[PDB]
C-alpha cells in the first residue's frame, strides 16, 4: 500500500498510516552548498544529526469558528534544541526543512485544510502607513491567528483572511508548494522545502525564509459526539543545515 509513509531524521521517526503522497518543493531536494557557489571563505560547521531532527511545534485547537493560523520560519525554531544555539552563535545559516502537519478525526467529521509554504511572505500593516514591531507576526513557536473581519488595531498586521495578509486572493495560494488535509481521506500533509533565497547564505534572525499557513476552506462540522475540538500539531525537521561566522551569542 502507498498510504503508509515513514520518515527517519536523526534520532526521531515519524509514521503515518493514512496519508497522501509527499510534495518536494519545486522538484528539488535539499543539498549542501557547492564549492563553486560559496562566497564565505572559512570552514563551515555541519552538526548533522544534532540539528537535523524532528521538533514538535506546540499544538492548537480546531474549532467550528476557526479562521486560520500562520508560523514564520526559522524564527519558530529560534529556541529549540541545538538548532537554536547554532542560530544564536553563528552569523550565517542555510538549511532546508521537512514540514509534517498532523490532524486526525473520525469518519463522521468533515472539513478541509490548506497547508502551504509561502516564501518571502511580506505582510502589510493594519493601518496604511504607520509601522509595527517584530512581535505582531513572530514571537517564537506560538501561532498567530487570522481574522474574519478587517483588522483595526494599528499595532498588528492586517489579518483579514480572504486577503491572506498579502493583498492577494486567498484562493490563488495553490501556486506555492502545498497540500490539502481532507478528513475524508487524509490525516497528514508532508512538504519538503529546499533552501530558496537570492544569496547563498543569510542571517537566520534578521530574515524570515518562508511562512507556513493553515487555512480551513471548509469549516469543521460534526453532530452528537463528545469530541468538541480537533487538535492540530506541526512538526518540522531541518535538513542539510550548515553555519558560518562564529561570533558569540547574539540576536
Amino acid at each position: 500500500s502507498d498510504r503508509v509513509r515513514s520518515i527517519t531524521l536523526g534520532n526521531s521517526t515519524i509514521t503515518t498510516q493514512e496519508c497522501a503522497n509527499v510534495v518536494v518543493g519545486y522538484g528539488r531536494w535539499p543539498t549542501y552548498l557547492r564549492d563553486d557557489e560559496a562566497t564565505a571563505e572559512d570552514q563551515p560547521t555541519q552538526p548533522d544529526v544534532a540539528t537535523c531532527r524532528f521538533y514538535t511545534l506546540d499544538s492548537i485547537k480546531w474549532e467550528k469558528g476557526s479562521v486560520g493560523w500562520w508560523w514564520k520560519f526559522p524564527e519558530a525554531l529560534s529556541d529549540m534544541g541545538l538548532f537554536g544555539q547554532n542560530m544564536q552563535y553563528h552569523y550565517l545559516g542555510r538549511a532546508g526543512y521537512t514540514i509534517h502537519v498532523q490532524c486526525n478525526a473520525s469518519k463522521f467529521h468533515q472539513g478541509c485544510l490548506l497547508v502551504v509554504c509561502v516564501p518571502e511572505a511580506e505582510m502589510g500593516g493594519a493601518v496604511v502607513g504607520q509601522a509595527f514591531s517584530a512581535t505582531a507576526m513572530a514571537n517564537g513557536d506560538k501561532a498567530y491567528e487570522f481574522t474574519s473581519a478587517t483588522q483595526s488595531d494599528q499595532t498588528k498586521v492586517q489579518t483579514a483572511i480572504h486577503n491572506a495578509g498579502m493583498g492577494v486572493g486567498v484562493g490563488n495560494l495553490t501556486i506555492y508548494p502545498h497540500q490539502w488535509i481532507n478528513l475524508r481521506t487524509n490525516n497528514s500533509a508532508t512538504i519538503v522545502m529546499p533552501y530558496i533565497n537570492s544569496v547563498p547564505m543569510d542571517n537566520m534572525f534578521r530574515h524570515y525564509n518562508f511562512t507556513l499557513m493553515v487555512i480551513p476552506f471548509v469549516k469543521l462540522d460534526y453532530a452528537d459526539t463528545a469530541s468538541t475540538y480537533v487538535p492540530i500539531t506541526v512538526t518540522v525537521a531541518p535538513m542539510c543545515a550548515e553555519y558560518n561566522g562564529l561570533r558569540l551569542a547574539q540576536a
Binding site: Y26, V67, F108, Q110, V170, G171, N172, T174, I175
Partner: protein
Amino acid sequence: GLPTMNTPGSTQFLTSDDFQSPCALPQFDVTPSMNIPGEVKNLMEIAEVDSVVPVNNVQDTTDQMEMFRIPVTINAPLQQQVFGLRLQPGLDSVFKHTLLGEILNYYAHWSGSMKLTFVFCGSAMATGKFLIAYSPPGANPPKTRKDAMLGTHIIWDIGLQSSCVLCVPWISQTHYRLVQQDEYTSAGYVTCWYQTGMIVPPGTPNSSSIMCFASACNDFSVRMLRDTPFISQDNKLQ
C-alpha cells in the same frame, strides 16, 4: 562617405523595438549566476496550475470565505440543479480573478481546452452521484437535467477518490477566441445536477460542501499582449 537616405520611421521611439545600444558601465563585472529553485520560463506554466474558483457569488455573502464552497443537502427533489455558470474564463466574475483569469487578462486572444476539478468535502460516510455537463453555445441554456444530458457530460461517483475531472473540449468555429468575449465568440455553459441524491447515516451533518478548481490543458495558448484593466491609479504613489 557612404551615400545613404533615411526612410520613414527614423528617430521614432517604438516601445516594442529590438535594437542594440551603448553600455553606460563599460566592462562591468556581473555577479556569478546561481540556480535558485523554481525557475519559470513561460507564463503557461503558471496558467496550468489549479486554483480555487469562487462559484458561490450569491450577492448576500456576509462572509467572503463562503464564496468558495457550494452547498449540498440530504433531501432534495429528484432532479435539481447544484450550480450553473458561463464559460467566459477572462470575463465572467467566477473566473475573472482566478490564477487562470489573471493570466488571460493580460492577453487578447486565447484557445485550447480547460480542466474543471470538483472535490467532495463531506463526511466519509456520505455518498452520492452528480451529473456535470458542458453545453456548447446555443440560443438557450439548459433548464432541466434532460436538457443538460444531451451535451458533453460525466457521471461522478463519490467514493474513496474524492475528486473528478470534467475536461471541457475545444469546440469552436475559429482558431481563437476573444478574452473580452462577445456574442460572436460565445463558449457555452456549465451546469451540475443531482444524479441520485446525497444519502447520510445517523450521526452525521445534514449538509456538505464542494469546491471547484480551474486550470488549462497542455494545448492552451494565448496571444496579443495587452494591459490588464484590473489595476489603476489616480495619483503618483509616494
